[PDB]
Design a protein around this nucleic acid. Structure first.
Length: 85
DNA sequence: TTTAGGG
DNA sequence: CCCTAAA
């Protein structure tokens, strides 16, 4: 499949979704926040959560592409610490 | 088919 | 994004 960087709203929709469902229900996350975004499958969302956690763990100057608002990176690490077992 | 992780 | 063992 063709590349397709995640936009800020998509991240936003993902972050909101996970804060409510967690990290073990990507099919529900997909249904809740990307139900009509045919190019994003629950495996892609699982993957974007994996990169987002990393993105939030590195310095801003080493991130690539459109900048994810600090606000979201913040909720990624808080939702990651919460749903971690 | 979905979950869960490495490739 | 892909590949796919397990469930």
């Amino acid at each position: 499949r063709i590349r397709r960087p995640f936009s800020v709203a998509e991240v936003e929709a993902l972050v909101e979704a996970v804060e409510h469902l967690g990290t073990g229900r990507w099919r529900d996350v997909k249904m809740r926040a990307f139900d009509n975004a045919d190019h994003r499958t629950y495996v892609d969302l699982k993957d974007k959560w994996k990169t987002l956690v990393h993105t939030a763990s590195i310095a801003p100057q080493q991130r690539r592409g459109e900048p994810v608002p600090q606000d979201l990176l913040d909720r990624v690490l808080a939702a990651h610490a919460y749903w971690s077992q």
